[PDB]
Amino acid sequence: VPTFKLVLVGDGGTGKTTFVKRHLTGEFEKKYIATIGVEVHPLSFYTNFGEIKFDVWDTAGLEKFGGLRDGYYINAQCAIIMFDVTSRITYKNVPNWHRDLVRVCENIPIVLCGNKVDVKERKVKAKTITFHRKKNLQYYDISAKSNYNFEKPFLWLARKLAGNPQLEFV
Amino acid sequence: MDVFLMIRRHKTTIFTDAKESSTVFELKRIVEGILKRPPDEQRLYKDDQLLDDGKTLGECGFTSQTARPQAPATVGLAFRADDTFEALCIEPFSSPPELPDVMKPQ
Amino acid sequence: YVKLISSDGHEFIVKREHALTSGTIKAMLNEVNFREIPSHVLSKVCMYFTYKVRYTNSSTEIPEFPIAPEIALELLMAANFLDC
Amino acid sequence: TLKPLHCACMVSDADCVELLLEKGAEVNALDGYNRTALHYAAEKDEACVEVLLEYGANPNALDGNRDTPLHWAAFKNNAECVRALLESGASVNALDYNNDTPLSWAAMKGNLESVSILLDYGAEVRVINLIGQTPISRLVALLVRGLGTEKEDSCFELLHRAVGHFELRKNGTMPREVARDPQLCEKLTVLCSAPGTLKTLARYAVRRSLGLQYLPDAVKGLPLPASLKEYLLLLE
Amino acid sequence: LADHAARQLLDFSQKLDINLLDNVVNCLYHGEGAQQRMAQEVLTHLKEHPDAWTRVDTILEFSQNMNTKYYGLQILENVIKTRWKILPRNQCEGIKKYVVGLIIKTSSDPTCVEKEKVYIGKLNMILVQILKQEWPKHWPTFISDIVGASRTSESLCQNNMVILKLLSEEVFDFSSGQITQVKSKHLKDSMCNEFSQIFQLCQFVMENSQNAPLVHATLETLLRFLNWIPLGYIFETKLISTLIYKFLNVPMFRNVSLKCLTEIAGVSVSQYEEQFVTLFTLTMMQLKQMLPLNTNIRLAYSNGKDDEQNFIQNLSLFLCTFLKEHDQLIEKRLNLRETLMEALHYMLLVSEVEETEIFKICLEYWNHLAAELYRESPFSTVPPRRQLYLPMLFKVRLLMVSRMAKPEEVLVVENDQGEVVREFMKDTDSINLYKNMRETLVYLTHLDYVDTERIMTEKLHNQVNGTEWSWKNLNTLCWAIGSISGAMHEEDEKRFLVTVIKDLLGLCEQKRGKDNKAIIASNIMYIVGQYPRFLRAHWKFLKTVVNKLFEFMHETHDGVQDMACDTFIKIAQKCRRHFVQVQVGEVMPFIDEILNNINTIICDLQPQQVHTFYEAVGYMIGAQTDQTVQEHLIEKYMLLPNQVWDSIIQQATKNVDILKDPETVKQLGSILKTNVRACKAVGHPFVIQLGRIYLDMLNVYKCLSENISAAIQANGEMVTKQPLIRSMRTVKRETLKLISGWVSRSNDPQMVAENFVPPLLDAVLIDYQRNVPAAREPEVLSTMAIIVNKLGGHITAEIPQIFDAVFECTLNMINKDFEEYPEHRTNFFLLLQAVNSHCFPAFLAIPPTQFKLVLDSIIWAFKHTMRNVADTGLQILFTLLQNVAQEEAAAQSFYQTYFCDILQHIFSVVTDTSHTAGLTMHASILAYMFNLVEEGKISTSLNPGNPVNNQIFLQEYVANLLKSAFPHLQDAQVKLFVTGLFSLNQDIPAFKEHLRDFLVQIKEFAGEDTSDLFLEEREIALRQADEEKHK
Ligand SMILES: Nc1nc2c(ncn2[C@@H]2O[C@H](COP(=O)(O)OP(=O)(O)OP(=O)(O)O)[C@@H](O)[C@H]2O)c(=O)[nH]1
Ligand SMILES: *[C@@H](CC(=O)NNc1cnccn1)n1cnc(-c2cc(C(F)(F)F)cc(C(F)(F)F)c2)n1
Ligand SMILES: [Mg+2]
């Protein structure tokens, strides 16, 4: 049956672990438990064309608690490079993570997610996220707790990966 | 409720409103009001059918539904011409002209 | 009451205020003679007088006033002359 | 889902429609929406309407609801379109599935020009559609909402003159929406209660008598005085 | 499980078992649970130990599976990054030769590439690190050797182009934050000198070679290099011509050629105009060749595959960029007018693509064009540029109206441990898209308002007769109609909106069925809400709209009621004035009629709609100017909820245990929510309503606090899942929200302080202190924070009481660990910042122990991980330092007691990786501290060295501290860094970059001037910086 793996990247303070935790169990988490190394989370989805499962790998975004760095990316077919709209610096680091990712990937499907749009202090102004364009990256404004666009990244990745532009979750 | 009656005799024409319960004697005083002819010297007809002076308007051939102020009912009247009931004669109105060409039906 | 005489010589008797509806009659104001109004129109205008004064300021719906198409032209002319 | 002539009417280009009418056998041809191209011509421009009418386009072409092109011409207030369609012989009292005559739709918008033309061709004012509305009723409903301006006032004036007399107090009382406008409800009530001058009634009877022909030219043959025929043309 | 075999991998006393290492590395990528956990742990520990050479030189040889060699390369990269300059030169040369040999052996095995693609790429990365650290001086011939090997064979040329790409990246785009400023400058200078030698090889492989993989690699390399290549190579050669002719018109090269052409076009130089013109002309010719003007681009994209979609997007990018940058040039070039129009048509066709990103890209240029044209002349439609562009504007407007992002954004969110509400978003991506479209459309309307009117009329009519009837189309048209608002003179707006409303009502009558009726209802309700200017000139129509809205709020069909309430509040906000006055022909102000009917209008709305409706009414009342009339209005306005309030209060007085009745608690919460909305809308005068319930509100708040504390004690934290507990916590939060909101709106600080404040201190703060920590309400702090922010000094006297009540108990929550109780941290530090910024004298008065605890709290604050907490801590500290500059009496004591510790803590944070976010604040604080030092302050920080000027003692102290933290730093490094601190004192950006530079060095076992220090260069930079801040 179909199966893939998924690796999460993005400097700390941008909700990398919260996305996977929510999708796994559904309830939000507030504590900023810094991620260590990588955690393997088996994930599942159901669509009009059946069930597709992701083996999600959560790479810590902190230089001090990262682990193997790019080695985690070796077998990955898809990944989300995420940041925070409230913290401007988290955006300036997106190109660095993108570089560290591609050099070990063959332009696989990659989605750029700008987290924490529910916060009303949008430090990362819209109209200045032009980077994702010139690297053919799919950009989503998202929020982990308010669930805004909370399914678009996975849906788009499934569409590009399983190869079925009519794919849809149910 | 009440009904409106059209009183005619020869070229004469008089209009009035009368209740259904009104007796034809009431209409006799109404005639007297403008005409010097006493009531006994008056007799009334509905399309030549003599009207009993004691008969009430409701029970006669006149009623509000039958006659409207826009659509009255003609009433024939006769005097004692030479101390004798003159034969009822209502002079009809001048005949209407002929409809112009434009107004004929389709 | 007032007595109305048509062009054709027919005479019509109506109470004052009823017949008073006509502006021509108000200007006239106990007799009125018409050289242009035939009897078949004088009776029609009298019926209109009673109809209007009966349904004047009527709360309930006013039933339509039937008019014969044949007389319509001279009926309108007479109404204008009397400016009822 | 439409023929090229219908699209040409969509753009409403006189040259395109007239040159395509060389194939004009499709002029009276239905399409995906059942709209005869003359409908679009009426909706858009008068020149297309004229040129289509030149080549035997059916003025009374129906549709999915039988809303002949005259109805749409009136609804859009295309005065020239309406007058041309009528002059070419359109059914002034054409009835849709709701019986909404073109005059009813013209009143729906309070557009003065189309209403004036339709009355001038002896349109029927006392028509009532299935839902029960009437031209004057809809025009009043527009006034209640406060929309419109002196133009709608003049349109109401013309309809009041034409209808001879009218009543709005359904079941002896005004409709709820009208009630909330006392300074207008009073005017409507006093109009309803007034029987109407005999001259207006005679005018209405004459206008019914004339029928479907073009009245102001028709009245020229009448022996009535000039001022009074003008009155018959709702100049007062 | 094999952990007993696993933990040997860290056994460096014995030779590595390459087989076991490879097995564990592979199981990492093909393991799970404890296997993956301990595998990654062991690998991370293994990568850290010193004997990396013995492991690498063995793994790269005897490793079987590729990722194991990859892990070995990662270890060697760590070695090259950390210990490079301290390796013996023997091992240096051995490593260089070994890696170059491995690269040559692997690269040339097939003709162009092999399964080692990741492995060879990482080998390239290793060599790139070696080159970064050895190139300009130790290998002055590497570039020539690379060029020669490239000319020799393609199996070497392609990998050499990859190497050059990687190096150019690392040297010109990823330098800051990973390489010292001076070293980066040196490398960039060397590359500037050595490029041409690469450039000729590039031109050869581009114009003569024909190995498609190689040429694609060369095109990628040129793209990357173009970010910094000297423009002489770009615009003064045949590169553009070769690109266009030989590579833009074949599927596997057009993408990269187009990217390169885009990058070239983006340049903004002025004297390369002719090169740009030729670029545009040839590119358009080629585009016509491959992409004919009449192509169905939308269908092509929908059916096309990744290559076609990418080409479409990059075509869009090239056109947009070139036009935004130089379109004026071609516009001036008369003969190319046809090409200009053809490009505009290209972008029109592309705009039809359904992809959001592509549509946004095109809309960017569309907005730029519209704004430029509007600036050219503000009057509506002759301007030259406008005269030229006019024919396209019709299609521009048609597209803008046919597509229009929906302005609204509504979400359903559950919060407060299970309470669901409705929320709106401000500036998500979709809202910004709508904003851009609306701005462009408004400009266009200012150009040709008549044409916009005509188009919108036509589209609406098309909807009417069913020719184009569709919910999607109707909604889009309505959003487009609402987009313009006041865009035209109010007479034209009058006519246009009259026509639109007539048509929409006609359509509503025409259609039938609940679905169509609901859709049309939502549509018109939206349209009216967006045209307050018209409504304020038509009292009758406004009244009718309000009445119809009232009618709708009784509707049970979903979606109607919410939209009705939203429209009502939107109308009230923009039209509040007309509801509280007698309009012509009116007897009483319309507000009075509304108030009398509040009983029945809301008989069917759910509580949220009720609150929104009350908010709208409150907005409507605020317009009232007469104080007495306003008071009567407010009395009647709040009459209804007050009745339930008083009933519940009386019942509780009879028996307080009713407060444990969930229904009563819910009703109280609803009443408080209504009051909160009313306070938000009405503003300051709402106090009259507040005073009527202030005392019993606080009393019930206290009672609920007691109940919840007892429940938590008897049941622990788990009981918070009880809906009853949820309800009490609701009540509390809403009470606090009301109080804080009114204080925010209030404008009589003395009256507030002397009347409403003390009851809080009585019935809230001691409550907070008494409650079990778990149930303590974090919002409590925010209320006092806002109260202080508004009152300024008037509340100063009570600051010690507030602090003794809340401060000590709060810190014990947030000092044990960095994580738990985050909201508490945020609220507490907001309160602390407010106190410091407005009530500083309070800190002077409180005992010195309390001040010491406050400083400890600030340090603990800016030592947190969450960036918001850290920034708040740093801002608090900076404000505190600023204020102390005035309290000269205690300023010296504060310095002597805390300055050295604060400086130590700042350096501790800066020298840590997990806090680079607050680099700017660190720079500002340090610059301020050193300005205080150098400019002169009376006291001396060390009694034994009393005559010793602080300017010297601090230098020595900081140098010693840095040495203690980082022993491996060379004394010259630390001395230069400290001297620069003074030198870079007034140039805050220079100071920040100097801090980052120092942060770079500490990560490496730097050598004794072994290609790291550049001391003379730094001396010159700092000495002038010292002169710079001097003057
Ligand atoms: N406003 C807002 N904050 C969120 C949202 N999701 C998560 N957060 C906050 O961000 C933090 C996310 O922590 P993590 O899940 O570990 O993700 P991270 O911030 O990238 O940290 P690392 O995974 O270790 O790199 C949480 O502690 C939340 O406080 C959200 O949807 N909206
Ligand atoms: C037409 C008939 C109607 O009322 N449709 N809506 C529903 C829906 N569900 C049940 C019953 N009726 N119609 C539709 N919308 C309007 C209308 C709405 C508004 C607004 F203010 F609510 F937007 C105002 C007006 C106005 F201005 F009074 F004409 C009409 N009418
Ligand atoms: Mg995490």
Coordinates of N, CA and C in Angstrom, one line a residue, chain A residues 38-123:
Chain A
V38 N 15.1 14.0 16.5 CA 13.9 13.7 15.6 C 13.0 12.7 16.3
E39 N 11.7 12.9 16.2 CA 10.7 12.0 16.6 C 9.9 11.5 15.5
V40 N 9.7 10.1 15.5 CA 9.0 9.5 14.4 C 7.5 9.4 14.8
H41 N 6.6 10.0 14.1 CA 5.2 10.0 14.3 C 4.5 9.3 13.1
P42 N 3.9 8.1 13.3 CA 3.1 7.6 12.2 C 1.8 8.3 12.0
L43 N 1.5 8.8 10.8 CA 0.4 9.6 10.5 C -0.5 9.0 9.4
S44 N -1.7 9.3 9.4 CA -2.7 8.7 8.4 C -3.6 9.8 7.9
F45 N -4.1 9.6 6.7 CA -5.1 10.4 6.1 C -6.1 9.5 5.3
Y46 N -7.3 10.0 5.1 CA -8.3 9.4 4.3 C -8.8 10.3 3.2
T47 N -8.9 9.8 2.0 CA -9.2 10.6 0.8 C -10.3 9.9 0.0
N48 N -10.8 10.6 -1.0 CA -11.7 10.0 -2.0 C -11.1 8.8 -2.7
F49 N -9.8 8.8 -2.8 CA -9.1 7.7 -3.5 C -8.4 6.8 -2.4
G50 N -8.9 6.8 -1.2 CA -8.4 5.9 -0.2 C -7.6 6.6 0.9
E51 N -6.8 5.8 1.6 CA -6.0 6.2 2.7 C -4.5 6.4 2.3
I52 N -3.9 7.4 2.7 CA -2.5 7.7 2.5 C -1.9 8.0 3.9
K53 N -0.7 7.5 4.1 CA 0.0 7.6 5.4 C 1.3 8.2 5.3
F54 N 1.6 9.1 6.3 CA 2.9 9.8 6.4 C 3.7 9.4 7.6
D55 N 4.9 9.0 7.4 CA 5.8 8.8 8.6 C 6.5 10.1 8.9
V56 N 6.0 10.9 9.8 CA 6.5 12.3 10.0 C 7.7 12.3 10.9
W57 N 8.7 13.0 10.5 CA 9.9 13.2 11.3 C 10.1 14.7 11.7
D58 N 10.3 14.9 12.9 CA 10.3 16.3 13.5 C 11.7 16.7 13.8
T59 N 12.3 17.5 13.0 CA 13.7 18.0 13.2 C 13.6 19.3 14.0
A60 N 14.4 19.2 15.1 CA 14.5 20.4 16.0 C 15.1 21.6 15.2
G61 N 14.6 22.8 15.4 CA 15.1 24.0 14.7 C 16.2 24.7 15.5
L62 N 16.7 24.2 16.6 CA 17.6 24.9 17.4 C 19.0 24.3 17.2
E63 N 20.0 25.2 16.9 CA 21.4 24.7 16.7 C 21.9 23.9 17.8
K64 N 21.4 24.1 19.0 CA 21.9 23.5 20.2 C 21.3 22.1 20.5
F65 N 20.1 21.8 20.0 CA 19.4 20.6 20.2 C 18.9 20.0 18.9
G66 N 19.8 20.0 17.8 CA 19.3 19.6 16.5 C 19.6 18.1 16.3
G67 N 20.8 17.7 16.5 CA 21.2 16.3 16.2 C 21.9 16.1 14.9
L68 N 21.5 15.2 14.1 CA 22.2 14.8 12.9 C 22.1 15.8 11.7
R69 N 21.3 16.9 11.9 CA 21.3 17.9 10.8 C 20.7 17.3 9.6
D70 N 21.3 17.5 8.4 CA 20.7 17.1 7.1 C 20.6 15.6 7.0
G71 N 21.3 14.8 7.8 CA 21.2 13.4 7.6 C 19.8 12.8 7.7
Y72 N 19.0 13.5 8.5 CA 17.6 13.1 8.6 C 16.9 13.1 7.3
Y73 N 17.3 14.0 6.3 CA 16.6 14.3 5.1 C 16.8 13.2 4.0
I74 N 17.6 12.2 4.3 CA 18.2 11.4 3.2 C 17.2 10.7 2.4
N75 N 16.2 10.1 3.0 CA 15.2 9.3 2.3 C 13.9 10.0 2.1
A76 N 13.8 11.3 2.5 CA 12.5 12.0 2.5 C 12.0 12.3 1.1
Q77 N 10.7 12.1 0.9 CA 10.0 12.5 -0.3 C 9.3 13.8 -0.3
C78 N 9.0 14.3 0.9 CA 8.4 15.6 1.1 C 8.7 16.2 2.4
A79 N 8.6 17.5 2.5 CA 8.9 18.2 3.8 C 8.2 19.5 3.8
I80 N 8.0 20.0 5.0 CA 7.5 21.4 5.2 C 8.5 22.2 5.8
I81 N 8.9 23.3 5.2 CA 9.8 24.4 5.8 C 8.9 25.4 6.3
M82 N 8.8 25.5 7.7 CA 7.9 26.4 8.4 C 8.6 27.5 9.1
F83 N 7.9 28.6 9.3 CA 8.4 29.7 10.1 C 7.2 30.4 10.8
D84 N 7.5 31.5 11.4 CA 6.5 32.3 12.2 C 6.3 33.7 11.6
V85 N 5.1 34.1 11.4 CA 4.8 35.4 10.9 C 5.0 36.5 11.9
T86 N 4.9 36.2 13.2 CA 5.1 37.1 14.3 C 6.6 37.4 14.5
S87 N 7.5 36.5 14.2 CA 8.9 36.6 14.5 C 9.6 36.8 13.1
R88 N 10.0 38.0 12.8 CA 10.6 38.3 11.5 C 11.8 37.5 11.2
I89 N 12.7 37.3 12.2 CA 14.0 36.6 12.0 C 13.7 35.2 11.5
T90 N 12.6 34.6 12.1 CA 12.3 33.2 11.7 C 12.1 33.1 10.1
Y91 N 11.7 34.2 9.5 CA 11.6 34.2 8.1 C 12.9 34.4 7.4
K92 N 13.8 35.2 7.9 CA 15.1 35.4 7.3 C 15.9 34.1 7.3
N93 N 15.6 33.1 8.1 CA 16.3 31.8 8.2 C 15.7 30.8 7.2
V94 N 14.5 31.1 6.6 CA 13.9 30.2 5.7 C 14.9 29.8 4.5
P95 N 15.5 30.8 3.9 CA 16.5 30.4 2.8 C 17.6 29.4 3.3
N96 N 18.1 29.6 4.5 CA 19.1 28.7 5.0 C 18.6 27.3 5.1
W97 N 17.4 27.1 5.7 CA 16.8 25.8 5.8 C 16.5 25.2 4.4
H98 N 16.0 26.0 3.5 CA 15.8 25.6 2.1 C 17.0 25.0 1.5
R99 N 18.1 25.8 1.6 CA 19.4 25.3 1.0 C 19.8 24.0 1.7
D100 N 19.8 23.9 3.0 CA 20.2 22.7 3.7 C 19.3 21.5 3.3
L101 N 18.1 21.8 2.8 CA 17.2 20.8 2.4 C 17.5 20.3 1.0
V102 N 17.5 21.2 0.0 CA 17.6 20.8 -1.4 C 18.8 20.0 -1.7
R103 N 20.0 20.4 -1.1 CA 21.2 19.8 -1.4 C 21.2 18.3 -1.1
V104 N 20.2 17.9 -0.4 CA 20.0 16.4 -0.1 C 18.6 16.0 -0.6
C105 N 18.0 16.7 -1.6 CA 16.7 16.3 -2.1 C 16.7 16.7 -3.6
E106 N 15.9 16.0 -4.4 CA 15.9 16.2 -5.8 C 14.6 17.1 -6.2
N107 N 14.6 18.2 -5.6 CA 13.5 19.2 -5.8 C 12.1 18.5 -5.5
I108 N 12.1 17.7 -4.5 CA 10.9 17.0 -4.0 C 9.8 18.0 -3.7
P109 N 8.5 17.6 -3.6 CA 7.5 18.6 -3.2 C 7.8 19.2 -1.8
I110 N 7.9 20.5 -1.7 CA 8.2 21.2 -0.5 C 7.2 22.4 -0.4
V111 N 6.6 22.5 0.8 CA 5.6 23.6 1.1 C 6.1 24.5 2.2
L112 N 6.0 25.8 2.0 CA 6.4 26.8 2.9 C 5.1 27.3 3.7
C113 N 5.1 27.1 5.0 CA 4.0 27.4 5.8 C 4.4 28.5 6.8
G114 N 3.6 29.6 6.7 CA 3.8 30.7 7.7 C 2.8 30.6 8.8
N115 N 3.3 30.2 10.0 CA 2.5 29.8 11.1 C 2.1 31.1 11.9
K116 N 1.2 30.9 12.8 CA 0.8 31.9 13.8 C 0.3 33.2 13.1
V117 N -0.7 33.0 12.3 CA -1.4 34.2 11.7 C -2.6 34.6 12.6
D118 N -3.0 33.8 13.5 CA -4.1 34.2 14.5 C -3.6 35.3 15.3
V119 N -2.3 35.4 15.7 CA -1.8 36.5 16.4 C -2.1 37.8 15.7
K120 N -2.5 38.9 16.4 CA -2.9 40.1 15.7 C -1.7 41.1 15.5
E121 N -0.5 40.7 15.9 CA 0.7 41.5 15.6 C 1.5 40.8 14.5
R122 N 1.1 41.1 13.3 CA 1.7 40.4 12.1 C 3.0 41.2 11.8
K123 N 4.1 40.8 12.5 CA 5.4 41.4 12.2 C 5.8 41.1 10.8

